[PDB]
Design a protein around this motif. Structure first.
Motif, mmCIF file in Angstrom:
data_model
loop_
_atom_site.group_PDB
_atom_site.id
_atom_site.type_symbol
_atom_site.label_atom_id
_atom_site.label_comp_id
_atom_site.label_asym_id
_atom_site.label_seq_id
_atom_site.Cartn_x
_atom_site.Cartn_y
_atom_site.Cartn_z
ATOM 1 N N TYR A 197 0.837 -1.204 0.042
ATOM 2 C CA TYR A 197 -0.162 0.099 -0.140
ATOM 3 C C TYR A 197 0.906 1.332 -0.010
ATOM 4 N N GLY A 198 1.713 1.244 0.835
ATOM 5 C CA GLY A 198 2.594 2.428 1.103
ATOM 6 C C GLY A 198 3.582 2.819 -0.181
ATOM 7 N N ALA A 199 4.088 1.446 -0.638
ATOM 8 C CA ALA A 199 4.970 1.528 -1.762
ATOM 9 C C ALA A 199 4.045 2.250 -3.041
ATOM 10 N N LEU A 200 2.885 1.834 -3.163
ATOM 11 C CA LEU A 200 2.057 2.577 -4.229
ATOM 12 C C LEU A 200 1.868 4.025 -3.987
ATOM 13 N N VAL A 210 -3.860 -10.502 -8.506
ATOM 14 C CA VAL A 210 -3.360 -9.841 -7.472
ATOM 15 C C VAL A 210 -1.796 -10.186 -7.239
ATOM 16 N N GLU A 211 -1.685 -11.309 -7.382
ATOM 17 C CA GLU A 211 -0.408 -12.125 -6.884
ATOM 18 C C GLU A 211 0.836 -11.668 -7.864
ATOM 19 N N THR A 212 0.433 -11.643 -9.302
ATOM 20 C CA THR A 212 1.473 -11.072 -10.055
ATOM 21 C C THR A 212 1.828 -9.754 -9.928
ATOM 22 N N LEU A 243 5.331 -7.972 -9.116
ATOM 23 C CA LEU A 243 5.793 -7.015 -9.939
ATOM 24 C C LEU A 243 6.195 -5.751 -9.057
ATOM 25 N N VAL A 244 5.652 -5.444 -8.023
ATOM 26 C CA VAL A 244 5.929 -4.325 -7.215
ATOM 27 C C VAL A 244 7.196 -4.551 -6.496
ATOM 28 N N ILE A 273 13.182 -3.542 -6.296
ATOM 29 C CA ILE A 273 14.635 -3.725 -6.432
ATOM 30 C C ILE A 273 15.150 -3.046 -7.533
ATOM 31 N N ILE A 274 14.676 -3.078 -8.742
ATOM 32 C CA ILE A 274 15.222 -2.642 -9.943
ATOM 33 C C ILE A 274 15.280 -1.110 -10.092
#
Length: 492
Positions: free
Chosen positions: A72-75, A255-257, A261-262, A267-268
């Motif tokens: 959530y916070g990353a989004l 949602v798992e994909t 991806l998040v 990392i990237i």
């Protein structure tokens, strides 16, 4: 479209709120209510996701709920990057705050009405979008209130930001009580009313109290630029389109994909940004060495925030599933533990500030403070694994969880106050406008990574989970301490 700052300030009534412009009242309460609603929502959202349907919850698996809370916070971070650009080049900050507040309110309403998992998705979408427009822009409005040279500026920002921890502290006690003790939708409804109150004070008072502040577009797009920015949006639209055509027919549109991806981006994106800074032709050789020196600080920050941010995910689950809430006659709501972080920050911040003053020249350097933050973070996880390991089963006394939250704050008060300063000191001058985003990136990457770590968290792996992550923070903190002397000397 940019306006002279003295002219902007001249449109703002200069007194009316504790010796500050009346607009500080407006901004303080808009921000307080937005934070109250966000933290109130967060305090119960994790339980709402995994609680049984017959208990008013959504009935998701604990791991999925925890992973969703985690990202959530990353989004919000990614959204805020876009929202800062939108205010700067399209809306101006005042309109960004207004539209943002509207979306956030809609998001809370989506959870307050009877609904299920689809409503959760919609709520998160609206709150992510809305918070991205409101959160990184509301502070620019407070700055606009003080003319250049106005010595109340720093204090005004201080009063303003105090609303964050106040919201973070009160919301779990209010919204968490309502949502857990009575009804989840009631809880989410109170968060909605909170945001509504924020919007009301903003809309009703912004014209008189704020005048020109944030009402202009500082960096407007030329007609060609607007067409260029429109084209880039179409490029982004093609990228999502082409993904759907690949993902959907193969059953990968899940949602798992998305969570995975998040994680990958967690990392990237930092790696790419470090290469961009290091390889930039607009940097000096001295700056390039400083970018390298920043790497262990960025990693230490990420690791620190990983642990601190799990206070609202893993440890919220721990409060609910592993902790004796029935102590004395009172029944604690597990949501209430979300008030500990801001409480302890409010209480301890001035003590730390005093400490650094008294230490003076003897105080730890910035890299040493990062290291100390990490050591405390690691210790907080070692502490939490003990009662469960000693008991051999059953609920543990809530004091152990309190102590863990407290120890994390000791670390937070070492690392976080020098985070931006470290970032500014070690980032090239060409990248000076991106320093805030770079600093906040370590926290966002931590949250993206947290989501991937969730599946390792189970009753049978609890000791290994806390010990390995706590031990990793201890090991990294020790190493950072050791290389801190050279890092410190390189700081500008």
């Amino acid at each position: 479209a940019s306006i002279d700052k003295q002219q902007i300030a001249a449109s703002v009534p200069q007194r009316g709120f504790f010796g500050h412009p009346k607009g500080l009242f407006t901004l303080f309460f808009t921000e307080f209510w937005e934070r109250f609603s966000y933290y109130g929502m967060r305090a119960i959202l994790v339980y709402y996701m995994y609680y049984e349907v017959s208990k008013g919850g959504l009935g998701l698996d604990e791991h999925l709920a925890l992973a969703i809370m985690s990202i959530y916070g990353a989004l919000v971070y990614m959204s805020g990057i876009i929202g800062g650009w939108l205010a700067d080049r399209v809306f101006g900050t005042s309109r960004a705050v207004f539209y943002g507040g509207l979306l956030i309110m809609a998001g809370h309403i989506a959870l307050a009405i009877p609904g299920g998992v689809a409503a959760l998705f919609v709520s998160m979408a609206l709150i992510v979008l809305g918070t991205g427009l409101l959160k990184p822009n509301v502070s620019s409005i407070v700055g606009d209130m003080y003319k250049p040279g106005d010595d109340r500026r720093d204090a005004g920002f201080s009063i303003f930001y105090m609303g964050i921890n106040l919201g973070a502290f009160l919301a779990p006690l209010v919204v968490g009580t309502a949502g857990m003790k009575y009804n989840f939708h009631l809880g989410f409804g109170l968060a909605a009313v909170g945001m509504f109150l924020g919007l009301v004070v903003f809309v009703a008072t912004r014209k008189k109290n704020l005048g020109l502040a944030g009402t202009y577009v500082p960096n407007p797009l030329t007609p060609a630029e607007k067409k260029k920015a429109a084209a880039i949006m179409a490029v982004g639209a093609v990228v999502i389109a082409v993904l759907l055509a690949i993902l959907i027919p193969n059953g990968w549109f899940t949602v798992e994909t998305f969570i995975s991806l998040v994680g990958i981006l967690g990392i990237i994106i930092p790696i790419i940004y470090f290469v961009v800074m290091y390889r930039s032709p607009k940097t000096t050789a001295e700056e390039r060495s400083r970018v390298i020196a920043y790497i262990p600080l960025f990693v230490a920050s990420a690791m620190f925030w990983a642990i601190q941010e799990q206070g609202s995910t893993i440890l919220a689950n721990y409060a609910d599933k592993r902790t004796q809430l029935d102590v004395a006659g009172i029944h604690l709501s597990p949501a209430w533990f979300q008030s500990l972080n801001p409480l302890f920050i409010i209480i301890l911040a001035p003590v730390f500030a005093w400490m650094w003053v008294k230490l003076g020249k003897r105080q730890p350097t910035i890299p040493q403070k990062f290291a100390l933050g990490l050591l405390f973070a690691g210790l907080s996880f070692i502490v939490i694994l003990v009662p469960g390991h000693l008991s051999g089963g059953g609920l543990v006394h809530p004091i152990w969880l309190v102590l863990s939250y407290f120890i994390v704050v000791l670390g937070e008060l070492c690392l976080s106050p020098v985070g931006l300063s470290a970032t500014t000191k070690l980032a090239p001058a060409a990248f000076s406008a991106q320093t805030m985003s770079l600093w906040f990136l370590s926290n966002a990457a931590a949250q993206a990574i947290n989501a991937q770590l969730v599946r390792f968290y189970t009753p049978e792996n609890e000791t290994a989970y806390f010990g390995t992550i706590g031990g990793a923070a201890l090991v990294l903190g020790l190493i950072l301490l050791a290389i801190a002397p050279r890092i410190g000397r390189l700081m500008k």
